[PDB]
Scaffold this active site. Structure first.
Site, PDB file in Angstrom:
ATOM      1  N   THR A 196       0.810  -1.208   0.000  1.00 59.02           N
ATOM      2  CA  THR A 196       0.000   0.000   0.000  1.00 59.02           C
ATOM      3  C   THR A 196       0.855   1.275   0.000  1.00 59.02           C
ATOM      4  O   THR A 196       0.589   2.210  -0.751  1.00 59.02           O
ATOM      5  CB  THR A 196      -0.949   0.020   1.211  1.00 59.02           C
ATOM      6  OG1 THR A 196      -1.741  -1.182   1.220  1.00 59.02           O
ATOM      7  CG2 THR A 196      -1.886   1.215   1.121  1.00 59.02           C
ATOM      8  N   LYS A 256       9.367   1.829  11.157  1.00 61.60           N
ATOM      9  CA  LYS A 256       9.653   2.103  12.554  1.00 61.60           C
ATOM     10  C   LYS A 256      10.171   0.866  13.282  1.00 61.60           C
ATOM     11  O   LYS A 256      10.941   0.979  14.232  1.00 61.60           O
ATOM     12  CB  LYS A 256       8.400   2.633  13.260  1.00 61.60           C
ATOM     13  CG  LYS A 256       7.247   1.638  13.330  1.00 61.60           C
ATOM     14  CD  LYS A 256       6.594   1.389  11.986  1.00 61.60           C
ATOM     15  CE  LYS A 256       6.006   2.663  11.384  1.00 61.60           C
ATOM     16  NZ  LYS A 256       5.247   2.371  10.134  1.00 61.60           N
ATOM     17  N   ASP A 265       3.616  -1.067  18.216  1.00 62.79           N
ATOM     18  CA  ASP A 265       3.873  -0.094  17.154  1.00 62.79           C
ATOM     19  C   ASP A 265       4.114   1.275  17.790  1.00 62.79           C
ATOM     20  O   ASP A 265       5.025   2.008  17.385  1.00 62.79           O
ATOM     21  CB  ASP A 265       2.694  -0.033  16.183  1.00 62.79           C
ATOM     22  CG  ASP A 265       2.863   1.049  15.123  1.00 62.79           C
ATOM     23  OD1 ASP A 265       2.146   2.066  15.190  1.00 62.79           O
ATOM     24  OD2 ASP A 265       3.719   0.887  14.226  1.00 62.79           O
ATOM     25  N   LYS A 319       7.632   3.701  17.662  1.00 60.39           N
ATOM     26  CA  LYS A 319       7.645   5.128  17.357  1.00 60.39           C
ATOM     27  C   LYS A 319       8.116   5.992  18.519  1.00 60.39           C
ATOM     28  O   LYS A 319       8.867   6.942  18.321  1.00 60.39           O
ATOM     29  CB  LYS A 319       6.255   5.555  16.883  1.00 60.39           C
ATOM     30  CG  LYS A 319       5.814   4.789  15.639  1.00 60.39           C
ATOM     31  CD  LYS A 319       4.374   5.066  15.239  1.00 60.39           C
ATOM     32  CE  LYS A 319       4.008   4.299  13.972  1.00 60.39           C
ATOM     33  NZ  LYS A 319       2.570   4.401  13.611  1.00 60.39           N
TER      34      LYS A 319
END
Ligand code: MG
Ligand code: MG
Ligand code: MG
Ligand code: MG
Lengths: 331, 331
Positions: free
Chosen positions: B13, B99, B191, B195
């Site tokens: 994507t 990340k 996630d 970050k």
């Protein structure tokens, strides 16, 4: 440990805050192999009590050609211009917070900005990331930009919403450090016009003329007008807008009726809002004035310079808007 | 003029969005004296439908050494790591949105990041300014930082907020492509932890270990818990916090009860909130995921590179917290 020679132009609130910040943060500079050393500090009023060493005060212009950096924050246009040009011509970078100078003397300064010699994050929304915000937004194509860029007018409108009079609010803004002795530029929307021009130049048109910005201030606003707006679920704010019209970029500063829940209406501090393709909608907020806040921006640029990065560059080329923008309803 | 040869790792994507964005805005790059050309696009299976020409697809690793830039958005750690190291060692910059790779393979990547070879604005909050925001915040000393960095858990809480059960919310997040078939990384707060780790390294400690980030996910959240929150005028959000505790930096991700008026509680997209001295309080928000949003960030870094500016550098040195902090209460 080589010296980082700094020539500071301006010993006012901002200049003093900057000088002290640099010395306070000396250990951060050490990480870059440098120790800060000021060649001199030009001051308009050499007798005003200051936190700057007496031996550094300069009541008269001094040679800047041996500086590694020239930091300017004296306000006004012509005098600062004539003072910084020799340094820029020598290839010495200029870190400035002077939005008036950049907006009105672009004919003389653009060439140097074009070669990455001018750092001016502090010129818009003080130390709040406004220019770096748009630099990242370059990944997209601007659809519309709107911001509440002046700290004084924002404070005054916020206070009037609480019942305070224009006068009580303005004097307090001055006591708080947001506005200067004569806030005429601020209340007439000229300061916001200065900043909007700078944003337009960085994002869509490197030669955008300050004279094309249509600007009006908050002089006709009263607690009554603001309370009536609140009754309709709207908030009145002085908005600086950049949008497409007839296939050309149009910039204007004017009071606008905003929905009470709009990011610009509920922001803490000044704010910059944008819609761009394909990113979407994003915005940043923070203080738009103040000695400490502005000093943070100047110091941020000094670190940017030490990292090997160029100053803020004007947009590569002028580009038309992707769509006609719909302005917000005026007051 | 010259060519800007790009090796793209990842045809998903994000990869597809970046590929097409570059083609859509290719002529713009002429402003930098270059003409973009993709050398190839590494993908898992070229047989699948993709908005990238079949002939450009590579199912197996291909030489990257002729590339001017390597752009990566493969996800994962070890595979991407072994593919990009040869390019970085040869002095070719890496523009990444990964990340995970940066958070977990820092021991190998840090040296190159220090040389300014790694651009990763898209690795945190997609194309929304987050790294550039913090680069400007360097002008001040960080007091406390709190962000809502994961798009999936933000969507989920916004929905459960409305009365949707966790499973109902998650299913839609997945059915709409926000969450993967197995959403573990997102919902366990990993996630966000990745970050947060990146933000810490850029601003306060270049060596901040991902392993020291304490993460808690949505596992203990229900629609009722959110009603209890709504009743007390609060909103619950998964927040990544960086604050001082005991004179050292503490990093944690966990659901927090935020006053509903707070910028973080009001944010529709992902957001990053900061308090620093002397700047004060600054805030930035925008899309934190998505093809177009991420591509915008990757493209923004490509423009940053073309401008002669180095990539995102780790903090010049580590420094302890100026003040003791404390996140909002949890659940
Ligand atoms: Mg700024
Ligand atoms: Mg140019
Ligand atoms: Mg080459
Ligand atoms: Mg980002």
């Amino acid at each position: 440990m080589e010296a980082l020679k700094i020539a500071l132009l301006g010993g006012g609130t901002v200049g003093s805050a900057f000088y002290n910040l640099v010395l306070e943060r000396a250990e951060e500079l050490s990480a870059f192999g440098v120790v800060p050393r000021f060649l001199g500090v030009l001051v308009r009023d050499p007798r005003k009590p200051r936190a700057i060493p007496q031996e550094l005060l300069r009541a008269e212009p001094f040679d800047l050609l041996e500086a590694d950096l020239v930091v300017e924050a004296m306000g006004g246009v012509e005098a600062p211009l004539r003072l910084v040009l020799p340094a820029l011509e020598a290839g010495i970078p200029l870190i400035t917070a002077n939005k008036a100078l950049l907006a009105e003397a672009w004919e003389s300064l653009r060439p140097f900005a074009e070669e990455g010699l001018i750092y001016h994050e502090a010129s818009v929304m003080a130390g709040t990331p406004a220019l770096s915000f748009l630099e990242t937004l370059r990944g997209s194509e601007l659809l519309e930009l709107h911001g509440i860029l002046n700290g004084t007018t924002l404070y005054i409108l916020q206070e009037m919403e609480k019942g305070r009079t224009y006068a009580e609010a303005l004097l307090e803004a001055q006591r708080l450090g947001y506005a200067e002795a004569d806030p005429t530029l601020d209340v007439e929307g000229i300061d916001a016009a200065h900043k909007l021009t700078l944003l337009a130049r960085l994002l869509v048109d490197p030669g955008f003329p300050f004279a094309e910005v249509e600007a009006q201030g908050i002089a006709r606003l009263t607690p009554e007008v603001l309370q009536k707006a609140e009754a309709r679920g709207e908030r009145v704010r002085l908005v600086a807008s950049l949008f497409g019209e007839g296939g050309r970029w149009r910039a204007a500063v004017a009071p606008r009726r905003l929905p009470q829940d709009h990011p610009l209406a509920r922001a803490r501090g000044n704010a910059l809002w944008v819609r761009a393709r394909p990113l979407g909608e994003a915005f940043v907020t923070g203080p738009g004035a103040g000695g400490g806040a502005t000093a943070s921006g100047l110091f941020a640029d000094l670190l940017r310079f030490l990292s090997g990065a160029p100053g803020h560059l004007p947009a590569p080329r002028a580009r038309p808007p992707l769509e006609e923008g719909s302005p917000w309803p005026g007051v």
